Symmetry: D2
Subunit: 455 residues, 4 copies
Amino acid sequence: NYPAEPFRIKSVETVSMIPRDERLKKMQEAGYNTFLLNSKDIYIDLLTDSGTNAMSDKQWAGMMMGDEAYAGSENFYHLERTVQELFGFKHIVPTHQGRGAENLLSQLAIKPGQYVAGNMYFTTTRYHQEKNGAVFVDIVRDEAHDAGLNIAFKGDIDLKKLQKLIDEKGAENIAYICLAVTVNLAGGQPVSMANMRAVRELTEAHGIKVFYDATRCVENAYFIKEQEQGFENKSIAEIVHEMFSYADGCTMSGKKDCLVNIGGFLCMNDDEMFSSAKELVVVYEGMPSYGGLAGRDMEAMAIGLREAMQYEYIEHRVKQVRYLGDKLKAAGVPIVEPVGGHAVFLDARRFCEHLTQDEFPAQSLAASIYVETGVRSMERGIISAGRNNVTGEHHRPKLETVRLTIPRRVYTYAHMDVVADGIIKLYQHKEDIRGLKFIYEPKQLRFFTARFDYI
Amino acid sequence: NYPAEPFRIKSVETVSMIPRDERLKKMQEAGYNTFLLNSKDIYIDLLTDSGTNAMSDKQWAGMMMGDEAYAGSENFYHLERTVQELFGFKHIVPTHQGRGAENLLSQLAIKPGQYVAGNMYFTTTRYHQEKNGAVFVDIVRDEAHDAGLNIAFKGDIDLKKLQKLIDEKGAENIAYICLAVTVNLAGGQPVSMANMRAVRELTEAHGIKVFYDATRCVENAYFIKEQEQGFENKSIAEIVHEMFSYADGCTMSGKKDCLVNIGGFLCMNDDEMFSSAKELVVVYEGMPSYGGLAGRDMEAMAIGLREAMQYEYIEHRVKQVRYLGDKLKAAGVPIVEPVGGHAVFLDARRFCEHLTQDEFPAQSLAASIYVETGVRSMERGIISAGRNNVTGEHHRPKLETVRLTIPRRVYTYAHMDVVADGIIKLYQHKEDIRGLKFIYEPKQLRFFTARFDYI
Amino acid sequence: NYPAEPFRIKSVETVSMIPRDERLKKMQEAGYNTFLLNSKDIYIDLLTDSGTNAMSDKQWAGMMMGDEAYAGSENFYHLERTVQELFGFKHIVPTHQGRGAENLLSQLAIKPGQYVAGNMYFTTTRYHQEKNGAVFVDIVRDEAHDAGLNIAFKGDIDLKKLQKLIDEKGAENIAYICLAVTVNLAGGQPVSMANMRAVRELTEAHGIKVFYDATRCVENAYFIKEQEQGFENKSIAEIVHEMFSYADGCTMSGKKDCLVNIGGFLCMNDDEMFSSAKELVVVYEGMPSYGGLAGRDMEAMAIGLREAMQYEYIEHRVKQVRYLGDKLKAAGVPIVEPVGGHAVFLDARRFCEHLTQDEFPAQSLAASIYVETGVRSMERGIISAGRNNVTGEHHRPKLETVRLTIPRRVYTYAHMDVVADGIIKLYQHKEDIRGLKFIYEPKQLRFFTARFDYI
Amino acid sequence: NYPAEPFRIKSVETVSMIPRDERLKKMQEAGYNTFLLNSKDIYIDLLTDSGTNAMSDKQWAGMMMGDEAYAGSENFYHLERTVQELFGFKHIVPTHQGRGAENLLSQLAIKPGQYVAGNMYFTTTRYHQEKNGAVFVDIVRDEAHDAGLNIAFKGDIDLKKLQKLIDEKGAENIAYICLAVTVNLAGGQPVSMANMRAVRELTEAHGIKVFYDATRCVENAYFIKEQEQGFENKSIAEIVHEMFSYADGCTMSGKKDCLVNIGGFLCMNDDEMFSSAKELVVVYEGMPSYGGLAGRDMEAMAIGLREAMQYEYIEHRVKQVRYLGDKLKAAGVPIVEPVGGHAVFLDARRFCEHLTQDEFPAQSLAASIYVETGVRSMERGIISAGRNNVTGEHHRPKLETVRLTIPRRVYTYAHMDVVADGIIKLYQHKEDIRGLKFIYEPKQLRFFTARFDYI
Ligand SMILES: [K+]
Ligand SMILES: [K+]
Ligand SMILES: [K+]
Ligand SMILES: [K+]
């Protein structure tokens, strides 16, 4: 069920291994907010899968061959031809990471008052849409909003909803469909090739553009190879190329599936949009020949994207995350299902039914995990949702979760056991977990710097 | 007069060394546009002094210690302490380079219709001011606009013009003063400490904020050290710290004086503005704990800013540029005077007085320079100025220049001799340089991809 | 029982992942000799634990700070201070690896006809002793020669045999005692502190010198910590320092316990011997200030020896090897016992009891293991023993083994499972493993290039 | 006359720039022996051209791709095929540096009592010859021993002398001719292709083997291209390959002309000698598949040897050393002539005619140079010659020199001016240089650690 790592360890990152009593002190110094912990004090850091990937020896060799010319860099040429080959789009503009590409796309592709419809949303992606005057419309299938429902390709768009938006608003009033692979907010859920095809077919008929939010497109391609009938003789590369054939362009974060610590890019087929993109990138990112990246980083990202196409690599990536989910589920620990490509989400509401949402069960569970194991996880619940600035009440999200987000190629199954075993042990005495109260609350971005104490 | 390099060569960048006939074919394939040349075909690349710097062994050691954590990275803390120590500001927000810091500043500090006044301007800096509703006012001393005038501290603000603006417009209507060090548009001209102090004193009396465009603040500190009475017993670090003591914050490009290939940051003293800056950075750049940079780049920038404080390093940096300018001037080659900190600008109007501006003397001179020496330079004249959209006429700039822009720690005096001797030989038969005409002209950003042929 | 890796993965070594049929073709191209396989064709390479270690980010930072000066390098001074601090010797002479230190020691310390007595022996170590006129005497306890006997500190010297040698030969006729930690030939067996102390006390009483063959001294320190009464409150560093307090000097391979890919050194207390060692090092290795090493490697070895002192690192190192041995033993696979610090040795005589030694059971078993798993192992049996030049008969060794040798910080428990599960499956049908016969036999060093076919 | 560096600076090595009064203190703390100075206290280190070369970006990329397998490393394969291509020998055995290859060759190729004849000698090379029972015979042309004589190809063998050795001793009593390129002891003097051919022709007729001491064979190839008629249309590679076609094998130090900081190798054509070489390398260096080098170093050396074949690189290398010599000679400073490929040697006897050899003019001149400029040079005179252990008198060498030895790709012409200008300034008041006396003298290797004071 679970393959060994399809690589060896070339170099290691040293860790302190501080014991429980010392971790409790660090957690207190951090006001029980994992976002305030110091990296040097953490054994296993599952705060994010963004930008913390372990690069290969070949990428590090590329890092030594940075050609830092303002224009005409060999590294820009390599990235451009690699993305043209693997994603199949005509034009590429580098950006420093994914949200830089989102800024450009939304300024280029939206008229004020138009709709952008997508399969759920991501914070930066949707901000740039709305900042530019779009109204967001969620067209994901209804099941994706049910966190416990175990169905395949849970990230699929509901074609009926797309049809109704077209019927009610008119095609000329829809800027574009923003189709994300995988779907982050539903827990990293994949989208089927059948769905990408059907969405292309209906939008094309109406003259409507489609742009992917493509940050975990390789994880997605793996779910298609594993679970979609007809794809068993296809390579990961073949699946990735067909996926993008159903789009007019994409925004990409190299920090996720391109196996790098920084980097992103915007792709499109249209020449006029490319010309406009080049004049705007200069303002926000840099020249079209580097887009806010060192030459060595264009090189690392070109090499990493190609490494991601290796079947054994992405199979192990997804099955390692699956192992953690399987082990938690086998012990009765409540999690979002099915497990996604990049993370396991604990259902903190169910984990701590002895607590009210106003006692911050997700924030507290995350604190408990670090103290007991040296593992950092992210609060994705009531705290991150923020306070209603009109009423003064918490926004109360339906999802009250702790995200165990897994960087690529950094951890082993033994690290996964450290994580699972500690959570399972906490779950056996789940009632002992204490509620939290604010002792310091910022007006904005409160998850980042808020401090708490036990009730 | 001209010191030796205060460092040894640790590693080299290999070059092809292709001869004149082969360079002529490359120039023709690039349509006589140096922006279109491949980096792999160039011996000495003086297109820019941005982000092409040679890092040290110590910076490379730091590159291997990237702590890629989303929050709490050791590299963030090191950058933050370093900038607090050396610049003297309370708060720091990393950005991927300088224009990312400008975007944040202009959104936070400007109400539509307010004025932003500075000592001349830079393209991205003024764009971000104008995009947010500011009206730009030039308050540099009149002398700065006379490219032939040899005077010290030519970058100084005219206190009388600053004063007139306040009287005629009202303090409440001025968003801030944007004081740049050095002043790029005048050829890299320094600003005196006496000027920085007088501006602080006047603005403070009216409650007006001052923010520095600080990209070449260390080169600026060197000029003060060399030429301003009273600064002979002061270190570069003491001068830099006093400079920033007369500001409310700054936008910085590490890609210039911090000796790195990517990186920048925003500094401010005000607690409220810091909180707002953290909200905005997340949508354009990244979390406040990395700001669109890999941990290793925060580390390389922290180390490089400290290396920039070494007296012998910056003396050599500035005197290398001076060597090139002195050698050209002694042969009668027309240049912008006095030579600034980072570049030498050739007056192509005067160099090719036999051509009209319509025949693109700067574009043609930069082409000749590549063919004859393997040196790439930047057109900064009528081509880069663009065409008037409304009328369809060229914008005809007063400055018709070729910029010989010098990366830090990359080249030797022998390389400077290749550059100078080739230009001097061309000058001796300047009448023979041919005019250019468009064969392909983009509607936007024409300097980046336009192609030409000889008349 | 089995701790998780006390480090994260910083970078990876990419592997091909070729399937069984393709591995069989590679094995055939290598003439069924694992020594002849290409590294690029191997998934898990257990040929050696020498010089294949994964370095840390901190060691890689040191690799960028190589001070390549012929004398007075900062890296030399750092190595020298570190070894003085941790090993407690007065003088240090770097060598390119351990056998370079052995060459110097044996030339300096042996008069022709004198005896060198030790706890078993290693090939290079004993060669250098014999080449200089020493007669080797084995003074290990008899139990060490019983490969099946499970006892602690199996590497211990028999004080009664040491005593007999002194009585029968005379102290003046003993050049030195060569005490090895751990003892490689018995499978990596540790020596107790009590034994080291008793040997020092006896030799000192007769004026006999003791020099340690120290290549796996840290693994040895771990066993003492785990199993010798009285050492529970002692650090690894305290144990290492006390170990070397009972010697006059040592030969060390950094390629083993100092966590590097190249490097070694010679230590001694005696001023006169140090002066002589400096004269000799210049002709074989290099100046005493670098000893056949790049400055960056002196740095990486100084850093790596200090990292080896971390309790969690060495506990994990030794327990990973133990995991592999435990899993094999539980399935009934015959191995040398108890499992040592660095490797597991399969008893191929017992594994392939259906074959005669003349049919090369160890060579054949190592071939099968590669075909079935992509794991490379070393023949340490009749092939490596060589042929008798005088008679032309095989040397027929008591030990007919396949060595599963484990590089430090390179592999995971999942990799250990690939190794074990493949061997266990082979064991279940052991009768089917075929004998080998030579098709090409070199006159010298036959194990390195001999080729075979199945009988 | 003097080409610019045919490369750019990729990274730099930071230096302290300590002033004169501080340098005087360091020199005193070092007992006026430059060999005792710390690297961190030196601005320009010309102690040696061995192993201090600046590697390229491509070599550093290779450094990240180290394949550290005990056998079958991709890096060993690359080195082997590179040396086979460029030097043209059948077999290669890596060694950690040149003197490791010398140890093997001399043990394999000499019977006790035989002669080895060569064009002068090098210390390690000759030691290994004699240790194995050879009698050394100098067969260089008589002119090479006249240090002031300006003739081309001053390193040539005197064919008449070779003939007389053959006539008087008999061919069967000559182990081999050891032909060195360039000839170090005469100041780095080249050998002509005509001479290498004639030596091959005479030895072949008598059945006598020829092995090169090849450490600066690329410098040598450059002198042939520049000065030997018939070689002007030949590439450096073509000249190098023909050179080696006149030999039976070679010993090579990568630390000189292969542009690396560590590494060497032994080459031969004979199969039986190759087999014997492989059994002996194991004892002293390591397996024939790595020979005492990390895989990354076999890779760097393979890449560096190929870089050395670039005409512009080796032309600049030799002409940079020539510039220093020309500038010194133009000021009347006495030097060994003609200037060689890798160093300038000052004639300290003539520089300080006011001193006797017993007052150590070379040791003192070297001290003066460091104090006045921050430049380290090596004593190659009476001190290095050592004391006669029978008589107690100094060995009094004819040559009393200070070696300014130039690492490859590390320094600029401005560093050369620092060196020359300081020596010239010292030369104008040459009479002020004070004699030295021993205050501490070791019995052996006295140049390395002896301490002095002014008379
Ligand atoms: K990162
Ligand atoms: K750059
Ligand atoms: K190795
Ligand atoms: K070296």
